[PDB]
Amino acid sequence: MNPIILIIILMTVMLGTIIVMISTHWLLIWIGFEMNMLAIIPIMMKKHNPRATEASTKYFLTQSTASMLLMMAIIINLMFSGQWTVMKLFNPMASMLMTMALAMKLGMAPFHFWVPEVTQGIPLSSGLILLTWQKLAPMSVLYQILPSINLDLILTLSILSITIGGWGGLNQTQLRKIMAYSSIAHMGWMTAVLLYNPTMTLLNLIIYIIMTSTMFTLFMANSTTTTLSLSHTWNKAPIMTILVLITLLSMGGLPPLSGFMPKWMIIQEMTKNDSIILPTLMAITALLNLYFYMRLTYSTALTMFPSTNNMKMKWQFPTTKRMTLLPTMTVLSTMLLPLTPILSILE
Amino acid sequence: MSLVYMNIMMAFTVSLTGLLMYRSHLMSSLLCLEGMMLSLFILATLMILNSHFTLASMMPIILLVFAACEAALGLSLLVMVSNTYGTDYVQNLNLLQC
Amino acid sequence: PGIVELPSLEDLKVQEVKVSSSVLKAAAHHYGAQCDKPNKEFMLCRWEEKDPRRCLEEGKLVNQCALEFFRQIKRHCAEPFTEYWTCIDYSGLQLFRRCRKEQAQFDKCVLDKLGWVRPDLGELSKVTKVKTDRPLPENPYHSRARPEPNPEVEGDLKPARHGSRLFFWTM
Amino acid sequence: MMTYIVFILSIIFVMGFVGFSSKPSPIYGGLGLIVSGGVGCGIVLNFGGSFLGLMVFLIYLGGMMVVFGYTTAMATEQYNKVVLGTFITGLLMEFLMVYYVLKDKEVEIVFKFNGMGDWVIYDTGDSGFFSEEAMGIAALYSYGTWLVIVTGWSLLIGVVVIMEITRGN
Amino acid sequence: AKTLLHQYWDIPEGTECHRKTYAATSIGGASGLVVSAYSVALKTPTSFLEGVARTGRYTFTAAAIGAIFGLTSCISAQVREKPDDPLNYLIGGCAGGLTLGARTRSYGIGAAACAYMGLTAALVKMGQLEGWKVFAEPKV
Amino acid sequence: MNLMITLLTNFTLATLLVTIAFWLPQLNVYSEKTSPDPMGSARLPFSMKFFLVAITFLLFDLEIALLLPLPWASQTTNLNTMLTMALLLIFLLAVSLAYEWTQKGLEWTE
Amino acid sequence: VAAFLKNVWAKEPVLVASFAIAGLAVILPTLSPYTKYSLMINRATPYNYPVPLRDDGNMPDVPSHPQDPQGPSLEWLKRL
Amino acid sequence: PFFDVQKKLGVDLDHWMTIQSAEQPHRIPARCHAFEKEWIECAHGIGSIRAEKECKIEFEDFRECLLRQKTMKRLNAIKRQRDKLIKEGKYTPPPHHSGQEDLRP
Amino acid sequence: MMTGRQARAPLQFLPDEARSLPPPKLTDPRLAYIGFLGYCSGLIDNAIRRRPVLSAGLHRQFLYITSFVFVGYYLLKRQDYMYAVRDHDMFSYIKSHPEDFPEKDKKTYREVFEEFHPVR
Numbered sequence A: 001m002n003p004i005i006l007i008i009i010l011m012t013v014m015l016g017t018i019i020v021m022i023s024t025h026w027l028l029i030w031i032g033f034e035m036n037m038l039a040i041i042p043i044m045m046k047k048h049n050p051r052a053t054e055a056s057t058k059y060f061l062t063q064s065t066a067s068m069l070l071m072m073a074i075i076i077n078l079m080f081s082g083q084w085t086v087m088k089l090f091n092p093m094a095s096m097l098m099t100m101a102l103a104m105k106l107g108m109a110p111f112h113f114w115v116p117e118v119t120q121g122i123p124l125s126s127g128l129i130l131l132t133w134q135k136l137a138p139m140s141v142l143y144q145i146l147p148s149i150n151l152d153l154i155l156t157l158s159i160l161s162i163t164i165g166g167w168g169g170l171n172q173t174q175l176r177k178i179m180a181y182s183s184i185a186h187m188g189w190m191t192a193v194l195l196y197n198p199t200m201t202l203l204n205l206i207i208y209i210i211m212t213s214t215m216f217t218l219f220m221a222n223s224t225t226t227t228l229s230l231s232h233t234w235n236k237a238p239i240m241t242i243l244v245l246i247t248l249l250s251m252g253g254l255p256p257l258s259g260f261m262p263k264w265m266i267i268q269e270m271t272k273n274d275s276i277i278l279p280t281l282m283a284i285t286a287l288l289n290l291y292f293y294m295r296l297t298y299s300t301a302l303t304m305f306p307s308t309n310n311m312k313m314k315w316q317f318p319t320t321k322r323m324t325l326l327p328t329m330t331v332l333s334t335m336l337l338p339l340t341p342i343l344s345i346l347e
Numbered sequence B: 001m002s003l004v005y006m007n008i009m010m011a012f013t014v015s016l017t018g019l020l021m022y023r024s025h026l027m028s029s030l031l032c033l034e035g036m037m038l039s040l041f042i043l044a045t046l047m048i049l050n051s052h053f054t055l056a057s058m059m060p061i062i063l064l065v066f067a068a069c070e071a072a073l074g075l076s077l078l079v080m081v082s083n084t085y086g087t088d089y090v091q092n093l094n095l096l097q098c
Numbered sequence C: 001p002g003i004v005e006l007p008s009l010e011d012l013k014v015q016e017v018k019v020s021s022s023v024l025k026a027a028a029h030h031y032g033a034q035c036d037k038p039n040k041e042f043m044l045c046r047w048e049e050k051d052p053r054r055c056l057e058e059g060k061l062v063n064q065c066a067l068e069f070f071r072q073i074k075r076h077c078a079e080p081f082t083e084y085w086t087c088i089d090y091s092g093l094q095l096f097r098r099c100r101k102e103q104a105q106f107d108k109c110v111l112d113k114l115g116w117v118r119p120d121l122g123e124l125s126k127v128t129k130v131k132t133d134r135p136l137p138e139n140p141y142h143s144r145a146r147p148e149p150n151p152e153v154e155g156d157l158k159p160a161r162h163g164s165r166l167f168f169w170t171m
Numbered sequence D: 001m002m003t004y005i006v007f008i009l010s011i012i013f014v015m016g017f018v019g020f021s022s023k024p025s026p027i028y029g030g031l032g033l034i035v036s037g038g039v040g041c042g043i044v045l046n047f048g049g050s051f052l053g054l055m056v057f058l059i060y061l062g063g064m065m066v067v068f069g070y071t072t073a074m075a076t077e078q079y080n081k082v083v084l085g086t087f088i089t090g091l092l093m094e095f096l097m098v099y100y101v102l103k104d105k106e107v108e109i110v111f112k113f114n115g116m117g118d119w120v121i122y123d124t125g126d127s128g129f130f131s132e133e134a135m136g137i138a139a140l141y142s143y144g145t146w147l148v149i150v151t152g153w154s155l156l157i158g159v160v161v162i163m164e165i166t167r168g169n
Numbered sequence E: 001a002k003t004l005l006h007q008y009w010d011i012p013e014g015t016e017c018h019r020k021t022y023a024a025t026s027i028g029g030a031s032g033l034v035v036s037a038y039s040v041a042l043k044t045p046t047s048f049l050e051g052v053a054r055t056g057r058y059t060f061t062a063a064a065i066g067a068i069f070g071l072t073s074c075i076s077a078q079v080r081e082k083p084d085d086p087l088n089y090l091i092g093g094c095a096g097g098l099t100l101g102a103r104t105r106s107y108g109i110g111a112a113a114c115a116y117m118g119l120t121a122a123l124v125k126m127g128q129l130e131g132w133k134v135f136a137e138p139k140v
Numbered sequence F: 001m002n003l004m005i006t007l008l009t010n011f012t013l014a015t016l017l018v019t020i021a022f023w024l025p026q027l028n029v030y031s032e033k034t035s036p037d038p039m040g041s042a043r044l045p046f047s048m049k050f051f052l053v054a055i056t057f058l059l060f061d062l063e064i065a066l067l068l069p070l071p072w073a074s075q076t077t078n079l080n081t082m083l084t085m086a087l088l089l090i091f092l093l094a095v096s097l098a099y100e101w102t103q104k105g106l107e108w109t110e
Numbered sequence G: 001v002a003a004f005l006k007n008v009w010a011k012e013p014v015l016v017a018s019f020a021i022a023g024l025a026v027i028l029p030t031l032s033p034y035t036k037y038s039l040m041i042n043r044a045t046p047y048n049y050p051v052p053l054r055d056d057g058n059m060p061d062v063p064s065h066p067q068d069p070q071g072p073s074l075e076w077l078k079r080l
Numbered sequence H: 001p002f003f004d005v006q007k008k009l010g011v012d013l014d015h016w017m018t019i020q021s022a023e024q025p026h027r028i029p030a031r032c033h034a035f036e037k038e039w040i041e042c043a044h045g046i047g048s049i050r051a052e053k054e055c056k057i058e059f060e061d062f063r064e065c066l067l068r069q070k071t072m073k074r075l076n077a078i079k080r081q082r083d084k085l086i087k088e089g090k091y092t093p094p095p096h097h098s099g100q101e102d103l104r105p
Numbered sequence I: 001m002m003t004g005r006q007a008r009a010p011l012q013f014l015p016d017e018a019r020s021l022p023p024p025k026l027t028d029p030r031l032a033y034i035g036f037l038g039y040c041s042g043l044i045d046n047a048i049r050r051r052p053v054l055s056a057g058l059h060r061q062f063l064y065i066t067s068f069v070f071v072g073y074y075l076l077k078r079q080d081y082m083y084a085v086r087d088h089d090m091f092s093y094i095k096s097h098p099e100d101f102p103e104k105d106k107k108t109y110r111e112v113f114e115e116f117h118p119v120r
C-alpha cells in the first residue's frame, strides 16, 4: 500500500471511532461505525491472499448486520421518543436491538463466531487494530446507554462470552485465535460490570488494550503466528521469552501483575451489589484463559523446544523492527498493581 | 401504533431472517442486506414525514448514501471472492476453520 | 383526563366571505392596507393564545372587516375589479404579471374614488406593532409546576480523608 | 379500498421481500428487490415524500440496484422446493397478519398496531409556498455542515478503498 | 420461559407431585429444544430425519432428566416431610444424573452427572432459601 | 391518482403490444425448427474494469445524490456556508475523479 | 510559469478550461459587489407570516401599519 | 467515553437535528413541538432517574402525541360502536356526515 | 458514577477547584514508583535491542524516567482530585439527607448481650 494512502485510511479509522465518541446524534453514531468499517476493510486486505478476503468478507457481513440492527434500534428510538439524543433508549425493544448490535460489533458470544476466523485471516497489525481499537467505539455507546440496557441480557452475554472465550482457546495452537478467544473472555469481563460500575469497565478496557498491544507487539517483533514458531524465540532472542512470560502471566490475572487489577476490582464492584455467585463463577472460568496462557508459557519461556540449524544465521542479525512502545507497554502491563487506585482518573 | 409501520418492520424482519439464513450465494446475502437498508429508509422516511420534523428529512438520504457506499464495498468483496473461486458461494469461504 | 371544551355552533356562525381565491388575490394588497388593524389584532391573539377557542371574536372581526372591504369595492368600483379578478382568474398560477393593465385600471379607480394606496414591495411583509386591551397569557402552554433542580456543589474542596481508602492503600 | 391504499402498498412491499428473502437466484432476487423498491417508494410518495421517493428511484434503484444487477450479471453462469416453501410460508404469515388486523382493528406482533387506515394520523394544515421535506433537505448545506463533511469524506475514502482492495497488489 | 421457572417454584415442596413433575418436565423440554436448535445450527445433520431425530433425542433426554428430578425431589420431600431441605434436591439431582447416564448409556457419566447436578440442585435450593441472586440488580 | 391512471395505461399498452408481438406470429404454423456465438462453450470471463466503472458510477452517483438539493439550497439565508459546502461537495467529486485518474483506474475504458 | 501554461493549453485545453472555470467559481463570489445583494434578497423574501408585536408603548422603530414610514424598506430591490 | 468535544470547543456539530423543537428552516414547527418542549423543560438538568418519575405525565402526553395510540383507540371505539348501531338500525348519520350540506367557508 | 459532576465542565483534566487541593510532593512514593517504572522501561528498551542494559543510552533512560514522572505527576493530581470530589459529594449528601443517616446510639457492653459459644 502507498504510505500516504495508509496514513489517510488509518486516520479515517480513528476519525470513525472519534465521531462515535464525541457525537450527540444517533445518526452520527451510525455514521462513525460505517466510516470505521469502510476504512478498516483495506487494513485487513493488506497482503492480498484468499484468507484476508475471506476474513474481510466475514467481518463485513457481521459488522453490516450489526450496523443495520443499530439503525433499527435508532429508528425505534425515534418512534418512541421523537428525538435523536445519544442517551438512554425509550423502548426495551430498541435497547435489546442496540445491545445485540453492539455485542456483534464487539464480537461477544454468541456473536463471537467471527472473531477467531477474522483475526486468523488478517495480519498481526490489523489484528491488533481489530482487537484493541475496534472495541472503543461500541463500548462508548454501551457506556452511554446503560440506563436502558437490560440486566439479564448483558449478563447473559457476559457469562456466555467468558465461558466460550475460556473453552475456545484451550484447543488452539495459532496465536491469533488464542488472542481472539482471550478477547471474547475479556469482553465478557468488561460487560459484566457495566451496569454496576462503568469506571471498572473503562479500567478493564484500558488494561486489556495495554496487555493485548504488548502481546501483538511481541508477536510482530518476533514474527510469530503459531505456538511452535514462538517456541524458537529462546534461541533467537531470550529477552522476548521473559517478556511473553510476564505478559501472559499478567493476562491470566495472576497477582501481583496488572491484569489481576481489573477482574479483582470487578469482583470488588459486583459484591457491593450483592452478587456473589456470578463473580465467583466468572473468576473460576477465568482459570481456563489462564490455562492456555500457561500452555504458551510452557512452550516459550519455561522450557526450551528444539530449534533448527538455520537459526544460527539469524543470530548474526539484530531485530530492525520498530518495536513501538514495547518496553513501555511491557512495564505498564506487569508492574502496575501498586498503582491500582489510579483508576479514579477514569471516573 | 400505525398499521403501515407493522408492515415495514415485518419487512425488515423478513429481510433479516433472509440475511440470517444463507442458501449459497453471497449476492443473495447482499440483496437481503440492502432490503434491510431499504426498509430502514422507508420507516425513517414515514416517521420524519409524519412528525413534520423538518431537519431530519436529510437523514434518510444520508442513510441511503453511506449504506450504498457500504453496498459498493460489499460488492467489491464479492468480486474478490469471485476472482478466487469463480463463484460467490459461501461454502468456499471456509479456510478459517483451521 | 378532562373533557375538552368545544364552543357551540352558534359561536361559530358568521357571515362568510363567499368569494373565490382569485377575487381574494386580486384584492389582496388593498385588503392588507385597509383591513390591517383587526387582522393584526387577530393574528397577535392567535400566536399568543395558541388556541382558536380563545380567538373567535377577533376572528369574527376579521370576517366583519373583510365584508366591509368588499362592499366598499362593490359600491364604487365593481367593473374594474371584476375585469381584473377575471384576468387573474384565467391563469393557472394566477399571475399578477399577466394582468398589469387591469391592475392599473383597478388601482386608478380605487385611488380616485376611495383614496386607497396600493402597498409597495416590502410593506405588507413588515412586522408591525399591535395595541390590544386583552391581557397577555401568563401560561399559554398550560404548563404545570417544574421540578426543583438537584442541589448544586458548594464548599471548598478538602483533600480525601486518608486518601483513596482502597483496601490497604494509604494514599 | 382507496382509503387503505398505502397499507395495501405495504402489503405488496412485504410480499416483495418474501420474493427475495426466499432467495431463488440473485437475479430474480434483484428483480424482487426492484419491485419492492418501487412499491416502498410509492408508500413514501403517498405521505408527501416526493424528493425522497425519487431518491429511491434514482439512487437506490437507478443507481445502486443497477450495480447489483451488473455485478450479478458478471457472475452466476446463465443456463426450488426450499424457495417455494419459504415463499408460501411468508405469504401465509403476512396474509394471516392482514386477516387478524382487519377483523380485529388491532393486532400485537411485538407492538400494538391499529387496524384502521393510516390516513387517520395525518396533519390538517398547509405548508404555504414550500414543501417542508424539500426545505429540510435543502438545509443540508446551511445546517448540515458537519454532516456534509463526514459524508463527503466517507465517499472519498470509499473511492480510495475500492481502488485499494480491487487492485490485488 | 421465565414463567416456566415461576410455575415450578410456585408449588410448595412435597405437596402437589404431578404438576411439579410436569413443570420440571416442561423446563427440561425447553432446555432440550434450545440445545437441539443450537446443535442443528452449528452442526448440520445429514438429513431432515436425522435432524429431527437429534432434536427428539436431546429434548426427550433433558425432559426425562427434569421429570425424574422433580419426581424424586417431591417424593423425597413427601416421605421425609421436610420441604425447605436441600438434601431433597440433592437426591433429585443425583436421580437426574443417573437419568442422564442412562440416556448416554454409561455409568461414569452417570456418577459424574449425579454428583455435579446434585450439588447444583442443592445450591439452587439454598439460593431459593437464603435469596442468592445470580442476576443481581444494581444497588450501589 | 391521475398519475396512477397514466402509469397503468402505459403499462397496459406496453403489455398489450408485447402480447401481440409474442402471439400474432404464433398463429402461423411455419415449421418446427431444429437448428443444432464467438465463444464456443467457454465460461464468461470476468473483467475487473467493467466492475470498476460500475462502482465508480455508484460512488459518483452518491455524490450526485448529495448535490441534488442545490437549487433549493441557494434560497437559504446562510449563503456563505451554503456556497462553501456546495463548492466543497463538487470539489470532493473532483478529487474522487482525480484519484481515479492518477492511479490508473480510468484505463482501457478511459 | 508562462511556458507551462502554453504547454498545457496546447496539450490538455479541456483541463485548462476546467481549472480556470473552477478557480473563477472559487474566488469570484468573494470579489463581487453583488454577493451582498443575494443575501439581502433571500432575507427579504417573506415565506412566513410577519407575526406582529404586542405594543408595549415604547417601540418607535416598529410600525403600526404596513404603509408607515418606519420599518425595513425594499427600494434598493426595486431600483438595484 | 462520551468525550464532550462539542461543549468543550463550543461548536454545534449535531445538536441541531437532535430534537424536533430546535431551530427549523422557515420556522416550521413539528407536529409535537409543544409537547416535546414541555417534556424537555420538565426533565432538564434534574437527571434521568428523577426525570423518569417526576416528568412522566409530559412524557406520556408527548408519546401519545407522537404515536396517537389513545386517539386511534378512541376512534376505533366510536367507529366500531357506530357501525354496530348502524347494523342494529338504532342510529342514522346526520346530513353533515353524509356529504349533503355545502361545507363552511 | 460521578458522570454528572464532571459534565457541566466537560473534558477538563484538572478543573480549577483541583488547585484548592495540595499537590503531590516531588518525593511522593507513588511518583517515585512511576519513576522506577520509567527506569525499568529504559532497561527493557536496552534489552530488546541488545544494548548494554545499564550503560547504553543514558539520555534515553533519563527521558524514560522524566516522561513517566512527568505524566504520573498529573495522573496523581487527577487521582487525588477525584477522591476529593468523591468525599465532598459524600459529605454534602450526608449533610443534605439527615432522615437517611441517623446518629445511632452507641451502647456499652454492659448493656449489650451477646451469646457465648464455648470452645470445648
Ligand SMILES: CCCCCCCCCCCCCCCCCC(=O)OC[C@H](COP(=O)([O-])OC[C@H](O)COP(=O)([O-])OC[C@H](COC(=O)CCCCCCCCCCCCCCCCC)OC(=O)CCCCCCCCCCCCCCCCC)OC(=O)CCCCCCCCCCCCCCCCC
Residues within 6 Å of the ligand: A256, A337, A338, A339, C168, C169, C170, C171, I027, I028, I029, I030, I032, I033, I036
Ligand atoms: C525536604 C524535601 C524532601 C523530603 C524528602 C523525604 C524523603 C527522603 C528519602 C527519599 C526517598 C523516599 C522514598 C519514598 C518513601 C517511602 C515509601 C515506602 O517505603 O513505602 C513503604 C510501603 C508501605 O509500607 P509502610 O510501612 O506502611 O509505609 C512506610 C512509609 O510511611 C511510606 O509512606 P506512605 O504511607 O506515605 O506511602 C504511601 C503509599 C504506602 O503504601 C501503601 O499505602 C500500600 C500499598 C503499597 C503497594 C503494594 C502493592 C502490592 C502488590 C504489588 C507488589 C509488587 C511486588 C513487590 C516488589 C517486587 C520487586 C520489584 O505508597 C504507595 O502506595 C506507593 C506504592 C509503593 C511505592 C514505594 C516507593 C517506591 C520507590 C522506589 C521503587 C523501587 C522498587 C520498589 C519495589 C516495587 C513495588 C513497590 O511498603 C510497601 O508497600 C512494601 C514494598 C516496598 C516499597 C518500596 C520501598 C521504597 C524503597 C525501595 C528501595 C530498594 C530498591 C531496590 C531495587 C529495586 C527493586 C528490586
